[PDB]
């Protein structure tokens, strides 16, 4: 159905395949490094070839958007009250302890946020956690006060793709969180799709990774799915050209030649 | 959809030979990426000749 | 009379179309019987007490809502019953009322349901006929009051023959208290409405 | 709507009105036309319809297909009615009328949907149809030479054109010659009942024959029949309506005797009555005896003894046909069997045709009737052959009425469309659009021919339009060459009456459908 | 042979069925187009009644079965989401395009050629619109906005009262105006809180110069009117402190139990005292407030509101300059509430509106906002007024963002049909038929307007086409491009002079979306419906 | 006759109309009009 939009889609697919593999010494293409993101609305003419990555997750830190010269950081621990792996309880036998517990929890959260900020980070990605609260409202308020854009609920299986794209290294403990594990980016902004949702686009990365992302638009869901399938077919064709570099004429010529 | 593999796997065929053709189209999709309709057409034509 | 090892072989795969066509209707029936036995046979084939607060409860129930009294929803077919029981969030309680017009004690409990629905927006009070459900004759003749309860798709109450424990001229407060005895009932007036993209506001930037 | 405690009409009364009702009527007419759309042209295809009793009818005739279809839509039944009307008046064009009417309705549907007053559309159809009929009568080709050879050739070509859409199109020349020969022997009334059509199972189509006389099946021969000679070389035929049997003299007759002598006399008297009738028949000089009433075994043996032939229970229509062929008179009384009441045929013979015995009466110079003996491989095969021959016979009869012909293959419709467009370009504009729609609707026939033949309809239509605009009245679709050609010189001839009646009936049906605005359906009575 | 457990339709049958479904959807809403259109009443088999004229609402409320019809329903929804106007015109145009394309296909034209022709025709129509038919609003002024709002509000329950409703709409949109980076004036509609309340006539609808809350004070002790409001916005509840799940209280010495229980409420007491010590008068919180905190606010003569909606609180904080505080924690680990976190308003009043009370925040400082209270005759009238008002606000936002408008009343589409039927002869040999059919289908909207007006559709459209043809042929008659339809008098009228305008984005997006939907449906030639 | 068994004697327009259950949406609109008039000013309920 996208034969009319081929003039736009075909160069997009060729560029997507070329930007993900080494032109020399390549024997296969891993299409999992070309992420396809489908966003309803617009027309097929609005398809994009975002160099960085797009995240469907919304910015929790509402009020801050379009961080320039972003130093992206990805963490795998939780910003909440202390909680050990084994069973833990805090016993209060005096009102002084009942004030000190709140005071010390606040101090611990503030110390975590200050340690994160001292590294120069200004965009934080938080891995999804289903055991403890990954981002408490106190932690979010502290991060907002220090002008850091927070993006939580990052999927567990999406960590590898994000790390390959941006260049951040996951941090699972605040002790090892340092500026050496941050990924510099030119711009990290949340774009608006003309009222059809919000996408979080991070375009421009120092030492770009070997990944590209394609954003597919359409009037309704069915044409979006078919456009995604067609783009995947084009990518697969270019991949099958990468290995076994041999070309034949189409148009029914090979089968009739075989018959003769 | 126009994709042969998607068409074949979306509809239930309930016949063993048809199911093997569906698996064949899926394999062609896995290996050669596209051409999943031509392979099924070729297999059907070959078996049609096998009848005679 | 031989060949016990029949091994029908090629027969099925050439006829499974009609077999599955019959099996679809069979399963559509089978879910209906499976859902329509959960109250049958098991119990179907078989001066602080003056409560001065109930009076003021009744008067405040009389002034419940302004817009309208509203009517209890009526189920028209078994399939509709199935697909409204199966649908809806499992976190809310749904209770179903079975009746046949003519028996005493039906209009009173219908009015009680109307009042409770007016004062409990979360509840989804609904009623069904005994004839449309096609229950047994014993249900139609000796189990007219049946207040089924659906909390997440399972019973937490199977009140059948509530006439003895409720009487024949009970009111809304009586049924409310009787249901609250076993903890069945979960615990302002706008002008008309307030609800009206996600872009909210910004300044200068 | 309000409950209205005492409602006006009977409950369940369904009333539909307004523009949606008319649009639904037009859609129903389109659906009906779709049923016979693929049966038109030399590349047309048959349709098979199974009734509730399991009987299957296979036909290419549009009227037959519409009749077998149980159409209950009140507006759609008009198309079936006009197909029946075209079959009755002309005998051919039953598919053309439905296509033309439904295409008229389809063309004016956009104007109906936008609120155009139906009276304007009706007036436009009336004007366009009158102009088209006048043009057909003006441009139809007739020659005032009145010679037998050219008239015979014209009849043969018209019959071939009528037959070149059925399963017998391969043998269309043979059957066309047979049909023209059969029609030419009818005297002045051209009655269909004077052309018998017999269907005998088994045998190729080319084995079907036309009998210059009369032929009918053997009719329940009694004992002693096989002794009768089965071939005569100049027989005299005694056409009778007499029951030659030993039977009670009258239903109310009652004999009262009181003597054994009178008993014997009565028995001998009955025998003598029968033998007197047989003696009169024998002394009439006849050698072949045919009776509408049963002929008994005694009479059969009596005729076998005299080297005579008898056949009782002969159908009445077959006796009328035999009387017309041989030239006798059906006698109810045997008292006066003169020489002028006996039929004469050159050769009478009984032969076996496909497992059935048939009596043949050939060599009748003064015959005014025929008999088609159709050979086929199936019951529906012979039925559809009979239908095709009926269409050809009606076409030949109408051509005998007047030798006014026009070229087929869509040529006449294309010329009419061009003329109507040229006329419509000279009127203020409200009628111009509707007459132009009529002219465009007239293009359905060549388009349907191309679609059925597997052509590209658009290119052929463009070429036909360009040719007709620049000259050439008789240019139409050429099926074999995948192109267009002069159909008049290609001998694709049909009488002008066919197209005149088709246009008239289609216009009347379209106007009747358009005029209706509200449909009311009363509840059924005795639903059982 | 196939042995597929389902029903299969192939060829002309499925195409005709798809076009039937699209035509049914179009005919559902065709009668509510243009000023002579009429509303529809929808009942949802429970008793709820929805009187509406919006195409998107009508198609959303209906339960639709056929997929080709659901395509048009989502098309209307998308047009509403991305533009906000023309949700009926897009559906009608898409259905007409599909019907004409099916007719072409039945004429043995391959659907690929029809799709290519439709793409070319849509591209050329957009180009011609952007080149010729647009009118720059720079030389028009506020009268252009007023006329655009009035045009958008026709065919609605507030159509006749447009002379006042358009002024209210324009005032609200200009009030909520803000600028961003790159110097682009952005107008955030949906920041205008639309409040409905039956009662007085529509002429009594109020445009609040501030914000309107659907909330009342938490207790009768507090005053209902504060003059020099110091709004304090909070995102946390003010209740008795309850310790977290990971902390439990174990008592071994009884003497500490009373101290623990006292501090359990003294914590919230101290928080409220910190909040009030800075001079705050009005306290709005998203969380709840219990009795003791309400009493604390009562004794100080403050105003406390609980259960405030998050979006309302955000809008109020942005307008008044307050900062939403999720907690009273600073960067020194203490509990502080600075005065800089206080918003300012010229007045906060709890007014009574038809036996109900709502809070009005008037003349906020550091930013101007707006809110509209709609007064009707019942709930249904107020809901329809709200829908029409939202349509007008979206139209005004489109006009203010993109400064180009096009004449209404079908002038643009008549001109497009003329130009496209002229241009079709210069493109292709078979796609030219598709372009011509696109041009003919573009005339469905003026035809529908004329039919709704019960006027002579054929003659009126013929006159309009003649005017536009003369405009496009004669080089000196470029002023005839604005000739549209006057539905009241049933005659052609220069709509640019009459003030019938609409944003160019409406027509452009509707054309693109209708073309894409028609192309999507046109590709289907085989349907397999597996049995459930 | 109240559906719950009560008895209502009145000649107030809104009091009478609030106790009538109707199926036609126009009647629902009229009843809502009656309630609007009663809530807004408390008088003239039959007149409207
Ligand atoms: N040999 C031929 N070449 C082209 N067209 C033909 C030929 N024979 C018949 N036709 C066309 O077929 C049409 C009628 O087809 P047919 O099915 O025989 O009768 P009808 O459909 O009118 O009942 C006529 O309009 C005629 O022009
Ligand atoms: N006063 C007017 N005179 C002529 N045409 C108008 C007038 N107001 C609106 N129209 C036209 O009526 C058409 C239908 O608009 P409408 O149906 O109300 O919007 P929507 O399609 O969003 O429902 C618009 O295309 C507009 O050009
Ligand atoms: N003494 C009176 N003489 C004449 N008209 C009266 C008198 N008292 C009241 N009315 C009329 O009766 C009407 C009041 O009727 P009422 O029962 O109050 O109905 P509603 O509540 O709808 O007004 C008023 O319009 C008033 O003009
Ligand atoms: Mg391919
Ligand atoms: Mg014919
Ligand atoms: Mg509008
Ligand atoms: Mg009064």
Task: List bound small molecules.
Answer: adenosine-5'-diphosphate, magnesium ion
Helices and strands of chain A, in order, run as HEEEEEHEHEHEEEHH
First-to-last CA distance of chain D: 31 Å
Q: In what order do the strands lie side by side in the largest sheet of chain D?
A: 6-13-12-7
**Continuous helix count of chain A:** 6
Category by helix and strand content of chain A: alpha/beta
* Residue fraction in strands of chain D: 5-15%
Give the assembly state of these chains.
Answer: part of a larger assembly
Number of contiguous helices of chain D: 16
Tell me the number of strands of chain D.
Answer: 19
Proportion of helical residues of chain A = 25-40%
What share of residues are in beta strands of chain A?
15-25%
> Rounded to an integer, what's the Rg of chain A over CA atoms?
24 Å
Shape of chain A: elongated
Binding site for ADP (chain A): 251
Family (chain A): Belongs to the TCP-1 chaperonin family.
Modified residues (N6-acetyllysine) (chain A): 114, 128, 145, 152
Protein name (chain A): T-complex protein 1 subunit delta
Give a quick rundown of the structure.
Chain C is of the alpha/beta class and 205 residues long. Chain C has helices spanning 10-13, 16-36, 52-62, 78-85, 106-119, 137-142, 163-166, 172-181, and strands at residues 73-74, 93-99, 126-129, 146-151, 158-160. Helix content of chain C is 38%, strand content 11%.
